[PDB]
């Protein structure tokens, strides 16, 4: 409870840790610690009744977040580990189930079968892109195919739990935590032309309530970098 | 010089042979190894994780997220089949496109057990009770609440726990995993009633496969 780090402090009270290994460190690279390790709290999304799902690309939503947006831009190469906190707060009269999963190398397919989706559609800068509950049309030029039952990658949506995941069951459970190591082939890769992770949240059992409660449930997501290292003389 | 003799089967090419081969590019000094996390060394490791079963197909909720959600509401009749599905191997059943099913469509012989982990996703104030009857193969499907209690079964409270795990063998009638209403759903006021149920499938890490083949889910 009341974990403190850097100059920002949040409060917790069961954590699933990646593929078993705790994130650790290794021209000459530098290891900055005093100006980066802080809990960057993203802005909160609203979970309506007929919602679909959201995603964030992980070394892209931290591109405007203060000092980290300089250390990504001044240092092209880099390698980091992450720590995610997702908690949605509601009463005892709400109901629903979330699936929080953190997929590595999440390639998405365009709507048109011959093109590829543009950059401003794959990753909103520190903002949640949203899934849809219908099909994305064919007549548009460059837009991401975001049918929720296939999760954008052309896979069965129920089979996504092979990745590091966690269930949020609003009847009993309340929060989820992930710890993700740096999973890439090349040890020091460019951070601008690469999105090595993707944090998805899909509602399986949709939100339901009675008349009189609040008609939305807010979800807050908090990311915290770890093992941040860059390249530069 | 040294006398030899060529046996038959000498200038032939077998598709599944293993002989030492000449390299095309020597002196390449190949890029070394790295401890990348998350290594798999046996394909049964994929089958141990849990995956959601699309048990609510009914030709209309197939292309949506209502395929995984079983509707449960407080009706007026006491005792009706909530859901039910057979366990026929491979013949278009509901366990076909899950993660356990997509590996076991590569082999022809397999024999072992299955964890069917359930989960009630409703409100935190609602109670109820459910029967989870498994019928052994050869015996008929139970058409009543009473004889389902006579078979092997497990009563599932909702207020105490929210997940009751059932173990069942599965071979290459064949069985039914039907589920019956024991009581209604007691709710307080200002709480909705139409709660849903998720279902998971797994491997009980105790079955082997033989005689590899290809899958039929391709052109």
């Amino acid at each position, epitope marked *: 409870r009341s974990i403190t780090l850097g100059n920002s402090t949040i409060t917790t009270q069961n954590v699933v840790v990646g593929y078993g290994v705790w994130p650790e460190y290794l021209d000459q690279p530098t290891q900055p610690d005093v100006a980066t390790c802080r809990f960057y709290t993203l802005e909160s999304v609203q979970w*309506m*009744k*007929n*919602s*679909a799902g959201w995603w964030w690309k992980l070394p892209d939503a931290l591109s405007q977040m203060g000092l980290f947006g300089q250390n990504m831009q001044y240092h092209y190469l880099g390698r980091t580990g992450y720590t995610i906190h997702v908690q949605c707060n509601a009463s005892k009269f709400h109901q629903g189930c979330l699936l929080v999963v953190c997929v590595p190398e999440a390639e998405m397919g365009c709507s048109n079968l011959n093109n590829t989706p543009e950059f401003s559609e794959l990753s909103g800068g520190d903002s949640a892109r*949203m899934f*849809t*509950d*219908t*099909q*994305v*049309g*064919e*007549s*548009n030029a460059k837009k991401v195919q975001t049918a929720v039952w296939n999760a954008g990658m052309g896979v069965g949506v129920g089979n996504l739990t092979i990745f590091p995941h966690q269930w949020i069951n609003l009847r009993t459970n309340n929060s989820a935590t992930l710890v993700m190591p740096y999973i890439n082939s090349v040890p020091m890769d460019n951070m601008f032309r690469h999105n090595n992770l993707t944090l998805m949240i899909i509602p399986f059992v*949709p939100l339901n309530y009675s008349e009189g409660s609040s008609p939305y449930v807010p979800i807050t997501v908090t990311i915290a970098p770890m093992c941040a290292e860059y390249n530069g003389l | 010089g040294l006398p030899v003799m060529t046996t038959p089967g000498s200038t032939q090419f077998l598709t599944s042979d293993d002989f030492q081969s000449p390299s095309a590019m020597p002196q390449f000094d190949v890029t070394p190894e790295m401890q990348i996390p998350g290594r798999v060394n046996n394909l049964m490791e994929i089958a141990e994780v849990d995956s959601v079963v699309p048990v609510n197909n009914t*030709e*209309d*909720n*197939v*292309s*949506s997220l*209502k395929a995984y*959600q079983i509707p449960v509401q407080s009706n007026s009749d006491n005792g009706k089949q909530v859901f039910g599905f057979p366990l026929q191997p491979g013949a278009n059943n509901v366990l076909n496109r899950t993660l356990l099913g997509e590996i076991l469509n590569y082999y022809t012989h397999w024999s072992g057990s299955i964890k069917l982990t359930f989960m009630f996703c409703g409100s935190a104030m609602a109670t109820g009770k459910f029967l989870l009857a498994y019928s052994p193969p050869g015996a008929g499907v139970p058409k009543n609440r009473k004889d389902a209690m006579l078979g092997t079964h497990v009563i599932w409270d909702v207020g105490l726990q929210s997940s009751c795990v059932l173990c069942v063998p599965w071979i290459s009638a064949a069985g039914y995993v039907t589920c019956w209403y024991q009581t209604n759903i007691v709710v307080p006021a200002d709480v909705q009633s139409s709660c849903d149920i998720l279902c998971f499938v797994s491997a009980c890490n105790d079955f082997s496969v033989r005689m590899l083949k290809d899958t039929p889910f391709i052109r």
Partner: antibody, heavy 124, light 107 residues
Framework: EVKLVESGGGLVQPGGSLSLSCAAS????????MNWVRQPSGKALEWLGF??????????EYSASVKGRFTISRDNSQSILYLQMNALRAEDSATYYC????????????????WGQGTSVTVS | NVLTQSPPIMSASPGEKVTMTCRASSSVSSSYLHWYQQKSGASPKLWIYSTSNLASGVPARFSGSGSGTSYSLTISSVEAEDAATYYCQQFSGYPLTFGAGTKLELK
């Protein structure tokens, strides 16, 4: 009870523009999909394109033949709908309706249950 | 995808069993085909959705069936108020294409 009234029909020269307006009453506007179907006089129906609700991020999907020349946009303040027309031709002489779509079970079927009265747009 | 309704012109006396068909150029799903009814210069109204489920506020005589690429609709008895037009709608992909039309006049 739903009651969708639409206005803005009348004379327009070819090569110009036109802006229709379709008002909504009897429901919360940010929970139902809004469609637009034109019908030529005595001919088969053709669907133009729709607009999603607040929970889907307010996106649009037009048809293939009429993409670009039109634009579906909503107002955030009141339960009202706009339809921008640009560079009309002589063959868009039809009447324009206002349709609503809703969920039947828990999924999304593609039917349009409740329709407006229909305003008539002709060209010269 | 196009929809070949057949036939466009029918007339019927009160009391008979009348069928109309909707045949698709491809294999359209049973959950993506609906029926409408439009009176003489009036607003069109949904009649049957998803090929088996009646709408709200319709009599119980109308029922439809069919699967694959051909779908049909069956009325028990011809009455006095149901001489109008009919259309079937489909969705396998975009665009949403409509049918040719079934015009019905009383006898």
């Amino acid at each position: 009870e739903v009651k969708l009234v639409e206005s803005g029909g009348g004379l327009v020269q070819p090569g110009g523009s036109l802006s229709l307006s379709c008002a909504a009453s009897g429901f919360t506007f940010t929970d139902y999909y809004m469609n637009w179907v034109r019908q030529p006089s005595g001919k088969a129906l053709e669907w133009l394109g729709f607009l999603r609700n607040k929970a889907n991020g307010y996106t649009t999907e037009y048809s293939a033949s009429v993409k670009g020349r039109f634009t579906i946009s909503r107002d955030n303040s009141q339960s009202i709908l706009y339809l921008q027309m640009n560079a009309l031709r002589a063959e868009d002489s039809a009447t324009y309706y206002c349709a609503r779509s809703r969920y039947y079970g828990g999924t999304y079927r593609y039917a349009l249950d409740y329709w407006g009265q229909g305003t008539s747009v002709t060209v010269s | 995808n196009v929809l070949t309704q057949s036939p466009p012109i029918m007339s019927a006396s009160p009391g008979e069993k009348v069928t109309m068909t909707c045949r698709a150029s491809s294999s359209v799903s049973s959950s993506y085909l609906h029926w409408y009814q439009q009176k003489s210069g009036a607003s069109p109204k949904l009649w049957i959705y998803s090929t088996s489920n009646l709408a709200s506020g319709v009599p119980a005589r109308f029922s439809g069936s069919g699967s694959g690429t051909s779908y049909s609709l069956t009325i028990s008895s011809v009455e006095a108020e149901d001489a109008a037009t009919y259309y079937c709608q489909q969705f396998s992909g975009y665009p949403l294409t409509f049918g040719a039309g079934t015009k019905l006049e009383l006898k």
